[PDB]
Design an enzyme around this catalytic site. Structure first.
Site, PDB file in Angstrom:
ATOM      1  CE1 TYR A  36       0.745   1.798   4.170  1.00 55.86           C
ATOM      2  CE2 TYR A  36       1.069  -0.570   4.412  1.00 55.86           C
ATOM      3  CZ  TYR A  36       1.268   0.728   4.863  1.00 55.86           C
ATOM      4  OH  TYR A  36       1.974   0.957   6.020  1.00 55.86           O
ATOM      5  CG  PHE A  46       0.295   9.028   5.607  1.00 56.03           C
ATOM      6  CD1 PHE A  46       0.252   7.691   6.027  1.00 56.03           C
ATOM      7  CD2 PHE A  46      -0.833   9.576   5.006  1.00 56.03           C
ATOM      8  CE1 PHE A  46      -0.895   6.908   5.836  1.00 56.03           C
ATOM      9  CE2 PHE A  46      -2.004   8.806   4.832  1.00 56.03           C
ATOM     10  CZ  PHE A  46      -2.031   7.463   5.244  1.00 56.03           C
ATOM     11  CB  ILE A  66      -8.323   2.406   9.994  1.00 54.92           C
ATOM     12  CG1 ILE A  66      -7.785   2.243   8.565  1.00 54.92           C
ATOM     13  CG2 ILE A  66      -7.320   3.136  10.923  1.00 54.92           C
ATOM     14  CD1 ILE A  66      -7.566   3.559   7.843  1.00 54.92           C
TER      15      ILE A  66
HETATM   16  C1  LIG Z   1      -0.413   6.408   9.640  1.00 52.27           C
HETATM   17  C2  LIG Z   1       0.832   5.644   9.226  1.00 52.27           C
HETATM   18  C3  LIG Z   1       0.623   4.128   9.168  1.00 52.27           C
HETATM   19  C4  LIG Z   1       0.086   3.564  10.472  1.00 52.27           C
HETATM   20  C5  LIG Z   1       1.989   3.486   8.944  1.00 52.27           C
HETATM   21  C6  LIG Z   1      -0.303   3.784   8.022  1.00 52.27           C
HETATM   22  O1  LIG Z   1       0.142   3.849   6.889  1.00 52.27           O
HETATM   23  C7  LIG Z   1      -1.714   3.399   8.221  1.00 52.27           C
HETATM   24  O2  LIG Z   1      -2.529   4.293   8.403  1.00 52.27           O
HETATM   25  N1  LIG Z   1      -2.054   2.096   8.153  1.00 52.27           N
HETATM   26  C8  LIG Z   1      -1.100   0.996   7.930  1.00 52.27           C
HETATM   27  C9  LIG Z   1      -1.564   0.039   6.828  1.00 52.27           C
HETATM   28  C10 LIG Z   1      -2.981  -0.465   7.109  1.00 52.27           C
HETATM   29  C11 LIG Z   1      -3.923   0.733   7.247  1.00 52.27           C
HETATM   30  C12 LIG Z   1      -3.478   1.713   8.336  1.00 52.27           C
HETATM   31  C13 LIG Z   1      -3.721   1.081   9.675  1.00 52.27           C
HETATM   32  O3  LIG Z   1      -4.807   0.633  10.003  1.00 52.27           O
HETATM   33  O4  LIG Z   1      -2.602   1.000  10.547  1.00 52.27           O
HETATM   34  C14 LIG Z   1      -2.823   0.405  11.835  1.00 52.27           C
HETATM   35  C15 LIG Z   1      -2.860   1.558  12.850  1.00 52.27           C
HETATM   36  C16 LIG Z   1      -3.301   1.133  14.249  1.00 52.27           C
HETATM   37  C17 LIG Z   1      -4.802   0.940  14.362  1.00 52.27           C
HETATM   38  C18 LIG Z   1      -5.326  -0.347  14.308  1.00 52.27           C
HETATM   39  C19 LIG Z   1      -6.706  -0.555  14.427  1.00 52.27           C
HETATM   40  C20 LIG Z   1      -7.560   0.541  14.599  1.00 52.27           C
HETATM   41  O5  LIG Z   1      -8.924   0.403  14.724  1.00 52.27           O
HETATM   42  C21 LIG Z   1      -9.565  -0.864  14.857  1.00 52.27           C
HETATM   43  C22 LIG Z   1      -7.037   1.826  14.668  1.00 52.27           C
HETATM   44  O6  LIG Z   1      -7.908   2.881  14.829  1.00 52.27           O
HETATM   45  C23 LIG Z   1      -7.419   4.237  14.809  1.00 52.27           C
HETATM   46  C24 LIG Z   1      -5.654   2.030  14.533  1.00 52.27           C
HETATM   47  C25 LIG Z   1      -1.670  -0.533  11.973  1.00 52.27           C
HETATM   48  C26 LIG Z   1      -1.921  -1.913  11.943  1.00 52.27           C
HETATM   49  C27 LIG Z   1      -0.885  -2.840  12.049  1.00 52.27           C
HETATM   50  C28 LIG Z   1       0.424  -2.369  12.148  1.00 52.27           C
HETATM   51  C29 LIG Z   1       0.704  -0.998  12.153  1.00 52.27           C
HETATM   52  O7  LIG Z   1       2.006  -0.531  12.262  1.00 52.27           O
HETATM   53  C30 LIG Z   1       3.164  -1.326  11.934  1.00 52.27           C
HETATM   54  C31 LIG Z   1       3.711  -0.995  10.553  1.00 52.27           C
HETATM   55  O8  LIG Z   1       3.970   0.200  10.270  1.00 52.27           O
HETATM   56  O9  LIG Z   1       3.889  -1.926   9.729  1.00 52.27           O
HETATM   57  C32 LIG Z   1      -0.342  -0.078  12.062  1.00 52.27           C
END
Ligand SMILES: CCC(C)(C)C(=O)C(=O)N1CCCC[C@H]1C(=O)O[C@H](CCc1ccc(OC)c(OC)c1)c1cccc(OCC(=O)O)c1
Length: 234
Positions: A36, A46, A66
């Site tokens: 992604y 970001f 998310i």
């Molecule tokens: C904002 C920067 C990051 C976190 C690196 C990003 O790109 C991002 O936004 N994402 C990473 C790729 C999957 C989608 C998204 C994400 O969900 O990251 C989540 C953020 C945490 C989160 C999880 C569940 C939630 O609700 C049920 C929640 O609510 C606010 C937050 C995440 C999941 C797993 C690993 C992780 O970080 C480790 C890594 O960078 O690989 C981040």
């Protein structure tokens, strides 16, 4: 983009950039492997998994990511590339995720789906018990040891049905009802109303002994279709 949000409030908008293959899509519980890139609405990048060595992987439908991602990845085929526009309600809300994500931010992700596979329910993570959830259950509660469960089950060996019953029994006592150990362990990971398919390697099934009355030879892999109807814990 197409509004793929359950509430149809334009919370998650999906544009397909490249169509994938086959017909199958990841199911709740499946492990999913993607690359992604993420941008804010103004185009500020970001993050990207492309900037790192490994694909990003997560378990679908468990609030591990998310909400926009639990929604969107479920709609993808292998090989698909899509763009998803995610309102803050389906992402980081008013909190944001400093410093990268400001409060109340709409996010855009490009996502490519490479692979998905069933959930390995084993403690050793040796692929001995693999689940594919067909239909999600109701509450999040799961049966524990000693719970009385009601279960409709169909057991297959090489796609031939050998057992089909609706049972009420205590978890821990399945052996006496000709249920393999791995099936009872699988039930302990199921929610009320869940319909799942569970694949058992011989070590988690009837092993080197087999089950003669079911025409199951030594060292047989088995497949069960399971419906957890109800349970009372404890
Ligand atoms: C904002 C920067 C990051 C976190 C690196 C990003 O790109 C991002 O936004 N994402 C990473 C790729 C999957 C989608 C998204 C994400 O969900 O990251 C989540 C953020 C945490 C989160 C999880 C569940 C939630 O609700 C049920 C929640 O609510 C606010 C937050 C995440 C999941 C797993 C690993 C992780 O970080 C480790 C890594 O960078 O690989 C981040």
């Amino acid at each position: 983009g197409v509004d793929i949000s359950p509430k149809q409030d334009e919370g998650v908008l999906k544009v397909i950039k490249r169509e994938g293959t086959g017909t199958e899509m990841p199911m709740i519980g499946d492990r999913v492997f993607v690359h992604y890139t993420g941008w804010l609405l103004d185009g500020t990048k970001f993050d990207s998994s492309l900037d790192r060595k490994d694909k990003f992987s997560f378990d679908l439908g468990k609030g591990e990511v998310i909400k926009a991602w639990d929604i969107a990845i479920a709609t993808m085929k292998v090989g698909e590339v899509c763009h998803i526009t995610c309102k803050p309600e389906y992402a980081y809300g008013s909190a944001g995720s400093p410093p990268k994500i400001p409060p109340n931010a709409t996010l855009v992700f490009e996502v490519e789906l490479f692979e998905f596979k069933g959930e390995d329910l084993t403690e050793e993570e040796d692929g001995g018990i693999i689940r594919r959830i067909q239909t999600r259950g109701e509450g999040y509660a799961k049966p524990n040891e000693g719970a009385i469960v009601e279960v409709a089950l169909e057991g297959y060996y090489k796609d031939k049905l050998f057992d089909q019953r609706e049972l009420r029994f205590e978890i821990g006592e399945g052996e006496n009802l000709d249920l393999p150990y791995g099936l009872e362990r699988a039930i302990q990971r199921m929610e009320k109303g869940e319909h799942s398919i569970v694949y058992l390697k011989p070590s988690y099934a009837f092993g080197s002994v087999g089950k003669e009355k079911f025409q199951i030879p030594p060292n047989a892999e088995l497949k069960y279709e399971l419906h957890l109807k109800s349970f009372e814990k404890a």
